[PDB]
Structures are given as C-alpha cells and as structure tokens.
Design an enzyme around this catalytic site. Structure first.
Site, PDB file in Angstrom:
ATOM      1  N   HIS B 459       0.863  -1.196   0.000  1.00 21.80           N
ATOM      2  CA  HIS B 459       0.000   0.000   0.000  1.00 21.80           C
ATOM      3  C   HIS B 459       0.886   1.227   0.000  1.00 21.80           C
ATOM      4  CE1 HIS B 459      -3.495   2.490   1.039  1.00 21.80           C
ATOM      5  NE2 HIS B 459      -2.812   2.979   2.108  1.00 21.80           N
TER       6      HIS B 459
HETATM    7  C1  LIG Z   1       5.502   9.348   6.504  1.00 25.13           C
HETATM    8  C2  LIG Z   1       4.935   7.948   6.590  1.00 25.13           C
HETATM    9  C3  LIG Z   1       4.827   7.189   5.451  1.00 25.13           C
HETATM   10  C4  LIG Z   1       4.301   5.896   5.478  1.00 25.13           C
HETATM   11  N1  LIG Z   1       4.146   5.223   4.298  1.00 25.13           N
HETATM   12  C5  LIG Z   1       3.639   4.019   4.356  1.00 25.13           C
HETATM   13  C6  LIG Z   1       3.416   3.303   3.140  1.00 25.13           C
HETATM   14  O1  LIG Z   1       3.639   3.790   2.025  1.00 25.13           O
HETATM   15  N2  LIG Z   1       2.863   2.049   3.249  1.00 25.13           N
HETATM   16  C7  LIG Z   1       2.575   1.481   4.466  1.00 25.13           C
HETATM   17  O2  LIG Z   1       2.061   0.349   4.470  1.00 25.13           O
HETATM   18  N3  LIG Z   1       2.770   2.135   5.619  1.00 25.13           N
HETATM   19  C8  LIG Z   1       3.287   3.338   5.575  1.00 25.13           C
HETATM   20  N4  LIG Z   1       3.457   4.026   6.737  1.00 25.13           N
HETATM   21  C9  LIG Z   1       3.123   3.377   8.019  1.00 25.13           C
HETATM   22  C10 LIG Z   1       1.681   3.449   8.315  1.00 25.13           C
HETATM   23  O3  LIG Z   1       1.239   4.845   8.408  1.00 25.13           O
HETATM   24  C11 LIG Z   1       1.407   2.745   9.638  1.00 25.13           C
HETATM   25  O4  LIG Z   1       2.055   1.465   9.714  1.00 25.13           O
HETATM   26  C12 LIG Z   1      -0.070   2.613   9.983  1.00 25.13           C
HETATM   27  O5  LIG Z   1      -0.753   3.880   9.876  1.00 25.13           O
HETATM   28  C13 LIG Z   1      -0.232   2.084  11.390  1.00 25.13           C
HETATM   29  O6  LIG Z   1      -1.623   1.873  11.656  1.00 25.13           O
HETATM   30  P1  LIG Z   1      -2.097   1.709  13.181  1.00 25.13           P
HETATM   31  O7  LIG Z   1      -3.472   1.212  13.044  1.00 25.13           O
HETATM   32  O8  LIG Z   1      -1.015   1.088  13.984  1.00 25.13           O
HETATM   33  O9  LIG Z   1      -2.207   3.254  13.645  1.00 25.13           O
HETATM   34  P2  LIG Z   1      -2.404   4.690  12.907  1.00 25.13           P
HETATM   35  O10 LIG Z   1      -2.878   4.490  11.534  1.00 25.13           O
HETATM   36  O11 LIG Z   1      -1.164   5.448  13.195  1.00 25.13           O
HETATM   37  O12 LIG Z   1      -3.638   5.162  13.794  1.00 25.13           O
HETATM   38  C14 LIG Z   1      -3.350   5.627  15.139  1.00 25.13           C
HETATM   39  C15 LIG Z   1      -4.419   6.618  15.495  1.00 25.13           C
HETATM   40  O13 LIG Z   1      -4.549   6.655  16.937  1.00 25.13           O
HETATM   41  C16 LIG Z   1      -4.837   7.985  17.321  1.00 25.13           C
HETATM   42  N5  LIG Z   1      -4.489   8.081  18.725  1.00 25.13           N
HETATM   43  C17 LIG Z   1      -3.263   7.899  19.284  1.00 25.13           C
HETATM   44  N6  LIG Z   1      -3.287   7.986  20.592  1.00 25.13           N
HETATM   45  C18 LIG Z   1      -4.626   8.161  20.909  1.00 25.13           C
HETATM   46  C19 LIG Z   1      -5.311   8.264  22.132  1.00 25.13           C
HETATM   47  N7  LIG Z   1      -4.720   8.139  23.312  1.00 25.13           N
HETATM   48  N8  LIG Z   1      -6.655   8.383  22.087  1.00 25.13           N
HETATM   49  C20 LIG Z   1      -7.267   8.414  20.894  1.00 25.13           C
HETATM   50  N9  LIG Z   1      -6.715   8.353  19.677  1.00 25.13           N
HETATM   51  C21 LIG Z   1      -5.382   8.215  19.766  1.00 25.13           C
HETATM   52  C22 LIG Z   1      -4.030   8.853  16.359  1.00 25.13           C
HETATM   53  O14 LIG Z   1      -4.667  10.107  16.202  1.00 25.13           O
HETATM   54  C23 LIG Z   1      -4.095   8.051  15.047  1.00 25.13           C
HETATM   55  O15 LIG Z   1      -5.153   8.483  14.188  1.00 25.13           O
HETATM   56  C24 LIG Z   1       3.937   5.331   6.722  1.00 25.13           C
HETATM   57  C25 LIG Z   1       4.098   6.096   7.889  1.00 25.13           C
HETATM   58  C26 LIG Z   1       4.534   7.404   7.825  1.00 25.13           C
HETATM   59  C27 LIG Z   1       4.653   8.211   9.094  1.00 25.13           C
END
Ligand SMILES: Cc1cc2nc3c(=O)[nH]c(=O)nc-3n(C[C@H](O)[C@H](O)[C@H](O)COP(=O)(O)OP(=O)(O)OC[C@H]3O[C@@H](n4cnc5c(N)ncnc54)[C@H](O)[C@@H]3O)c2cc1C
Ligand SMILES: Cc1cc2nc3c(=O)[nH]c(=O)nc-3n(C[C@H](O)[C@H](O)[C@H](O)COP(=O)(O)OP(=O)(O)OC[C@H]3O[C@@H](n4cnc5c(N)ncnc54)[C@H](O)[C@@H]3O)c2cc1C
Ligand SMILES: [Br-]
Ligand SMILES: [Mg+2]
Ligand SMILES: [Mg+2]
EC number: 1.8.1.12
Lengths: 486, 483
Positions: B459
């Site tokens: 992705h």
């Molecule tokens: C610059 C960048 C580029 C990337 N490019 C890619 C890519 O091309 N392909 C890929 O597969 N991955 C990529 N990633 C990684 C990807 O973004 C993450 O692996 C993914 O978003 C993680 O999902 P998650 O469900 O762990 O949390 P996230 O998607 O990070 O969701 C976490 C959410 O929790 C919320 N939150 C945190 N603490 C609290 C709290 N205490 N109370 C309520 N809400 C809270 C935050 O606001 C956030 O919206 C990239 C990351 C970055 C930073």
C-alpha cells in the site's frame, strides 16, 4: 456507554477491527481518536497515520515528484517544450494533497454515521480499568472526562510517533508531520535518517526545490535502508545521487542553531557543518503508549517500548488486545489491517486466525522505487544450509532512450537451494511496487524458482525478468558466499 | 552443407530453438532470414517481428505517447510550463526507435559470429525435400539458389504477416509494418480493426498528431478488443474516447480513393465517408506459409494456411516442426519462445515437454494499458457450473488530482466458485502489464481467491486491489449471470 469493543485509535488497524466487528458480527463498537481531520495540532486523525500524514499523502507527493523525471525523460521520445518555463508549484501540490486527505476524513465520518452500532468518540482514550476506557479532553490524564466507555473487549491501536533526537536546537527541526504542511518547498533541506521516510522525502524535496536548491540526506551508518537487499541499498544510493541528492553517510547532527536569516546551521558529530532551510528528522517512530496510562491496568511493554502481544494480538490482560505500530514490529498499514481483521475474526467470529508476519510484500516510493517480499540473502544464509541468488540488473532500453542511463532495474530472487523454494524477491525500478504484490501471493503458495521460470513472460515488461532467471548468480553455503557450489 | 537443425525464420521462436539446440545440446544449427536489419523492403528481419516491427518498437512508441498524458497530468501536482511550447517530435521518436532496433539487429549478428555451431544464412528458405532447405535470392521459387542445407530436422518459424482486405484502393492503405516508418506523424489517421495493434497505434498516433489532428479507429463489431474482459473492453473504449480518439464501431471500409491533395477518401460499408492522411489496416495477421513451398514435402496446412501441429509442435512430416505465429494459435513472442525451447528439449534433449497455452499472461499497451491472464468470465461460465466474479473499478485518487478522472482502474478475478480456483485475472490501468506477470505464476500454482485475499497488500498500489476482494460482485450459475 456499553460496547462489545472499544478501539483507541481510528487508524489503519483500529478502523478495520471496528468496521468488521460491527458489519460482520453485528457487535457494538466505540472508536476513539483525538481529531476528525488531518493536520495540526495532532496530525493523525480519523483514518490514522497512513491516511492523514503517511502512505496516502506521501504517495501523491512522490507521484508529483516523479514529473521532474518524466518532463526530462520526455525529450528522448521527441517531446519538446520550453525547459526554462518549468516550475514546480509546491503550494498547489500541498493544496491538492489536503483536499484528497480531507475527502477521506469525510468518508470515514460518513462510514460511522451510516453504520448501526459503530460510534466515533472525539478525545483522548486511556485505560481507567480492565473493562473501562475514559475519553478525556486532552492527553493530560487530569483533563475533563467526555465519556466513560464500558468494554467487553479493548483494542489498543494508537500507532506510532516520530522520534526527535534530544540534541541542542531540535526545536528548529521538523518531522514528517510538519513536512506535509510546509508553506514553501525548501531550497536546501537535510533529511536525517536512512529509512524509507527520509529517502522518500529526499525525493519529494529534490523535485520541488526552487532554483539553486540542494537536498542532502544524512545517515549515521555506512549505507542507507538497513533491512533491504544490499544490491538495492547500493543502487538506490547511486540513483538518488545521480538525480542530484547528496547522501552523507557516517554523519549525524550534534546540534542545530538558527542563523540570523532564519536558516539552520547544522553541526555534525564529525565537526562538519551544513546550512539548510529545513532539517527533517526521520530517524525512527516510537509506539504511542504513554497517553493510554497502561500503568493503570498493568499492560506489559517490551524492552523497546511496544505493547507485548502474542500471535493473536493478546496482551497479558484478558479482553485487551494491541495491533499495528503500537506493537513496534512491522510498521505497515496492511499489516495493521490484517491484524485487526484476524483479531475480530478470532474474538467475535469464532474463526481464530493469526497474521503471518513472514513474506510481507512492501515498497519504498523512492525514485526509482523498491518492491520487496520475504528474506534478504544474508538473513536466508543464516537459516538455510544452501541459498541461491538469481540476479538481473541492467538499465532498461527505455531509460537508454530517456537519458536516465543510471536507472538500472534490479530483480533478485533468493531461494532455499535444497528444494528451490523462493525465500525472497527484491526489485528496484519503475513499477517495482506494483510488480511485487502478486509475488506476495506466489510466496504464500511456496512458489519455487522453477514455478517462476516455467511461467510464460509478459513482453515487453520489467516483470518478465522474474520468469527469465534459471541459473544462480551465486550461493551461500553454511553462511559463506561463493560463485559456485562444492 | 549438413545441419542437425535448419530453422527457417530468425525470429522469437526460431532464435530460441536455434540457440538452445546449438548451445544446450551441442547441435550444428542453420538459421535463415530474409534481412539482417529492420525495415523496408521485408520489415521483419534477424530478431523477428517483435524485435523489428512489433513488441519492442511499439512499446517504445507507446512509452513516447504516454508523455502526452504525463505533461497534462503534471499540472494537478503543481507543475507549470508553457503549454503552447509543447511539440511532439515524431521524427525524433522514429530515429530513437530505429537506433534501438538496429542495435538489437547488430547484437544478433554478433551472437551468430560468436556462437560456433550456429550459422546464419541470408535469403528466402523453402523446402526442396523433407531433409533439404533451399535458400533463394527472393520469395519467387525460380530465383537463384544461394544455399542448399541438408537437415536432419527442419523448424518452420516464419511468423505471420498483416492481412489486407481485398477492397478497391487497398494500395492507398498501409499496415503496422509501414506505420513504423512514416517519416511524419499523420494529422488524420484511420486505424482499421478492434484488436491490440489498432488500439495501440491509435494511442501512438493520438499523442504525436500535429495540431488540429484527429485519430479515428473503426471496427466492424459492436465493441473493440474481442477476447478481452467485457468490463475492460467497455472502459478502454470510454478512456480512448476521453483522450480524443473517435471510436467508430459497426463500421468497416468498403473502398479508398485519393482526393486531389493526396489525402485518402474512405467510404465505409454504411456509406459514411472520412478523409484521412493514413489508413492503417490492422484487421488480422495470417501465417507466412506461401513462400515455404510446403507442397514439395506435403506438410499439412489448415484452410487458413497455418501449419498444423500436435502439442509437441510436430507436423505430419517426421523431422519437420513448426512453432510460433506460423501455427496460428497464440501470437505472442513469449509463447513462440516457450514452444521453441520445449521442442528442442523434446527432440534433442529427450526431455519431453509441451507448451501450456492456457493461463498465459499478456498485455495491451493501450493508454491506459491492459494486463490479463486466464479465462474471461463468459468462457469460464461455459466450462464451469458456478463461476464467481470479484470486481473493483474506480478512478484512483492520483487521477482525481491529475484531472484524468476517466482513468478507472479495473481489477477483476474470475473463479471456479466450487473450490475458489482462480480461472482469470483482468486488469486495466497504469501498471497492469507489470502487475499481471506474477499473477501468471499464481495461476500456474492453482491459486484460489483465498490465496489472493489472505496475502497482505502493498500500500498504496493499484495491485493491492487483487488482495482486497473477499466477496463476489456476481456469479454465473450453469452459464447464467446472477446478481
Ligand atoms: C511518513 C509515513 C509514510 C508511510 N508510508 C507508508 C506506506 O507507504 N505504506 C505502508 O504500508 N505504511 C506506511 N506508513 C506506516 C503506516 O502509516 C502505519 O504502519 C499505519 O498507519 C499504522 O496503523 P495503526 O493502526 O497502527 O495506527 P495509525 O494508523 O497510526 O492510527 C493511530 C491513530 O490513533 C490515534 N491516537 C493515538 N493515541 C490516541 C489516544 N490516546 N486516544 C485516541 N486516539 C489516539 C491517532 O490520532 C491516530 O489516528 C507510513 C508512515 C509514515 C509516518
Ligand atoms: C505490431 C505488433 C506488435 C506486437 N506486440 C507484441 C507484444 O507486445 N508482445 C508480444 O508478446 N507479442 C507481440 N506481437 C507478436 C509477436 O511479434 C509475434 O508473436 C512473434 O514475433 C512471433 O514469433 P515467431 O517466432 O513466430 O516469428 P517472427 O518473430 O515473426 O519471425 C519470423 C521471421 O521469419 C522471417 N521469414 C519469413 N518468411 C521467411 C522465409 N521464407 N525465409 C526466411 N525467413 C523468413 C521473417 O523475416 C521474420 O524475421 C506483436 C506483433 C506485431 C505485428
Ligand atoms: Br462485439
Ligand atoms: Mg454509527
Ligand atoms: Mg556461428
């Protein structure tokens, strides 16, 4: 205020778990996030890191950056235009990116309001007790309670956050979060770090820099993109260099001060200095566990800071699970999604399933990009007695015409030589991220090198190189590289 | 002169068989072709149709054509330049293409010089007798003998040739062969045919046409690209139209005359008329068997003029084989190559192996392109009691920003719903030819839909759509479509 499942983090993993639990198993779900749409102050919002300040906007900006190469390369195919008139309007790019991310944010809002028993709560989630999530107004545990959420099951899915090294003048530096919102493209920028985020942003800034600009990428060790295929790490280094990016390896910022003109004076540990307009730190992301107040219910963390989980995303506390970046393993959106889907299929669907963290296809939207699935040869060589490496590396004919002769397409297959089983596939070149996806399916099917070479090519493509490699380029035998077997 | 193998046609299939027989099995090999480098008068040459007047030069020219879209699409990502300064220089494209093809021609010359036991003969190969190939000055069998080659084994690998309809004024029309050599880009061009060559050249000419130019594609039937997925046929029609190409379906030329200015006056069967600068016939390709004098040995042809072969490429005459387009089956370079390699393993290696013509990945370098592997649903529906179709079709986000909002990416998976076995995968959109290659490997491994949806996505990509489809869009039950 009572739910089967409360999810803290409306991101890649949390929304997949939330939506599935509601729509597949008619369960009653609460999802908490700090913000409903992208950008300052909290950057991530409804949709999560990938949607707001991650994959989605990064990919649009890399696509925008690619036009620097297309406009140049067009000449070799006979395109003529006033080269002196070409400008890269960063503000237009950022405005288009913002509208695209906002529309997704609004899409998720519509998803919550349309879906019975799927409710979004704005604010900061933390653990009061084993079965109670409190939503407060701020990340301060002493801030007002907006909600008390009764939870038969709690999912932690708060993702990660950039690590900012504790050096004098770190306040003059940004992370990727601020990079997405820069009002003007920097003339001179230092991207700090050797991972995908630094490499991808170096590409973006390199394309949008105003005249007389310079992108410098620094990395504290010898060779960028640790954990990728070594051939590809070396080639991306050359191909970034070939496109005007300065790669300073074995260098690391010691401090930053403001020059009187508002530029940044970077002093490296080596004593070297560099003046830039922007210092973007991309040295790591760390799990967001602090704010959840995990001390309150005793959720165990790792010697690196991630929530400890078993293969079913279960913490030490029954009814409490953790997926995605908070687990500090593979920080990828489709892994988070996979884990969330498996968790809900297990807990609510009575169909236990564990995410496979092996043979995960992934990419770097470097210019040109990387696509990779499974083991690099040095890792295979430690696990398997005999490893074969099949390698094709040449500039495609079209880049001999484009004038980008440095754009070598690299295709490597790593096998268990005892049975031919493909252990990893590593690509560098235009289309590599698209090529690799169905390779991920091939590895799930335990494809062998003969399954690739017996498949008929699509011609002409880069991808057909993967079906043309019959003879190993070299081997590892008990960990030792050699051209030929004993 | 005596050979283990004589190959007539130094093309995709002929060179694979010749080189494998010479190098893998140490055989003495002769290979015949009519020209040492590309272009008029015979167009194909050493390296074959694909190298000289096919896949290789066409892919370069489509790549060139794609810049029309890149330049326009760049604006949405903030790129600015003087649009009024933009010119597509066709002469530069043809020159760049000519150098690329000639370098390949030269490299094959060097391969023959440096491969002992592999000898190239220039001229027209035909069968004198079941163990003699005669090489003559011209395609006329009364022309001067250059060589007589004694052959234990003879491979017919002469490829195909454009079909030209017998209409009044056919001489005012060209084929794809001449299109590769037009010195100037036509202002008005009619491409005749609904197949990949017509569609790919319509996109090339559409990009390089001079100001106020117009590309028209006509096709006799209701919908272009028969044999392809029907959603994709309909979407590629809309996407060509959106990029300024006029698709004239249910139309076919009846005759062509010259206007007083040298332009072509086309009269369609329907009575309708069209003035153009070039009429490019791309209605079919026919096997090149006329010149082989196969009546000298009694090799069985089809009424079409293809060489009849068994699954091991054997003709009715022992020791005479045929591979590639001459067999009038799948006209693809990699299939010709696969057949050549399988023939030499079988005949000279005693390693019996036949080419699987099922589940072959292929592409159309339309703009945007197609990548496909395996059965379309209408074919599957006739062979299987229950067929599922998984379909994803949407304008990717990048094309909402680029302004090409018409560029829907289509991803379709066709399954045997009884066991989930993937029967076909059909893609339309940027990257499709690159995505579909490893899908060919999946289908060889009898991948099921669950093998796709349980694979973790990369992705963001278009390709992750393939791994995100859990629920059929619709079904065929006993040949009937059910929602
Ligand atoms: C610059 C960048 C580029 C990337 N490019 C890619 C890519 O091309 N392909 C890929 O597969 N991955 C990529 N990633 C990684 C990807 O973004 C993450 O692996 C993914 O978003 C993680 O999902 P998650 O469900 O762990 O949390 P996230 O998607 O990070 O969701 C976490 C959410 O929790 C919320 N939150 C945190 N603490 C609290 C709290 N205490 N109370 C309520 N809400 C809270 C935050 O606001 C956030 O919206 C990239 C990351 C970055 C930073
Ligand atoms: C415009 C165009 C585009 C195409 N694009 C693609 C594509 O993208 N991908 C793909 O896979 N396929 C493509 N094809 C198909 C591909 O070119 C053919 O399937 C392939 O070249 C056939 O291989 P072959 O061995 O049968 O014969 P060919 O490669 O055609 O070679 C036959 C050779 O025999 C020679 N010859 C003929 N008669 C005689 C004789 N009597 N004596 C001596 N020599 C003789 C000819 O000069 C020629 O070089 C394309 C074809 C065309 C026309
Ligand atoms: Br039709
Ligand atoms: Mg709701
Ligand atoms: Mg020789």
């Amino acid at each position: 205020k009572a739910f089967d499942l409360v999810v803290i983090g409306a991101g890649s993993g949390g929304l997949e778990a939330g939506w599935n639990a509601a729509t597949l198993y008619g369960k009653r779900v609460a999802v908490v996030d700090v913000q409903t749409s992208h950008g300052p102050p909290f950057y991530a919002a409804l949709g999560g890191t990938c949607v707001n300040v991650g994959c989605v906007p990064k990919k649009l900006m890399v696509t925008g950056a690619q036009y620097m190469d297309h406009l140049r390369e067009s000449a070799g195919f006979g395109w003529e235009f006033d080269g002196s008139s070409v400008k890269a309007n960063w503000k237009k790019l950022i405005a288009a990116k913002n509208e695209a991310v906002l529309d997704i944010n609004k899409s998720y809002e519509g998803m919550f309001n349309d879906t019975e028993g799927l409710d979004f709560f704005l604010g900061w989630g933390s653990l009061e007790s084993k079965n109670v999530v409190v939503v407060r107004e701020t990340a301060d545990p002493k801030s007002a309670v907006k909600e008390r959420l009764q939870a038969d099951h709690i999912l932690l899915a708060t993702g990660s956050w950039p690590q900012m090294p504790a050096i004098p003048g770190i306040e003059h530096c940004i992370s990727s979060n601020e990079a997405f919102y820069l009002p003007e493209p920097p003339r001179r920028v230092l991207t700090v770090g050797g991972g995908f985020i630094s490499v991808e942003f170096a590409g973006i800034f390199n394309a949008y820099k105003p005249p007389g600009g310079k992108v410098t990428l620094c990395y504290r060790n010898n060779l960028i993109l640790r954990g990728f295929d070594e051939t590809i790490r070396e080639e991306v280094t050359k191909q970034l260099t070939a496109n005007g990016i300065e790669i300073m390896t074995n260098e690391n910022p010691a401090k930053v001060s403001l020059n009187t003109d508002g530029s940044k004076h970077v002093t490296f540990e080596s004593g070297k200095t560099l003046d830039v307009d922007v210092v973007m730190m991309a040295i790591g992301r760390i799990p967001r566990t602090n704010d959840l107040q995990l001390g309150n219910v005793g959720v165990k963390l790792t010697p690196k800071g991630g929530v400890q989980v078993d293969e079913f995303s279960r913490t030490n506390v029954p009814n409490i699970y953790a997926i995605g970046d908070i687990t500090d393993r593979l920080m990828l959106t489709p892994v988070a999604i996979n884990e969330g889907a498996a968790l809900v299929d297990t807990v609510f669907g009575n169909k236990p399933r564990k995410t496979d963290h092996t043979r995960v296809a992934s990419a770097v939207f470097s210019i040109p990009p990387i696509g990779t699935c499974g083991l690099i040869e040095e890792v295979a060589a430690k696990e398997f007695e005999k490893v074969a490496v099949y390698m094709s590396s040449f500039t495609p004919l079209m880049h001999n015409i484009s004038g980008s002769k440095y754009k070598k397409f690299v295709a490597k297959i790593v096998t268990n030589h005892s049975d031919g089983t493909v252990l990893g596939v590593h690509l560098l070149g235009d289309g590599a991220p698209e090529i690799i996806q169905a390779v991920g399916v091939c590895l799930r099917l335990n494809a062998k090198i003969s399954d690739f070479y017996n498949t008929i090519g699509v011609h002409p493509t880069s991808a057909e190189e993967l079906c043309s490699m019959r003879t190993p380029s070299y081997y590892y035998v008990k960990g030792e590289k050699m051209e030929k077997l004993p």
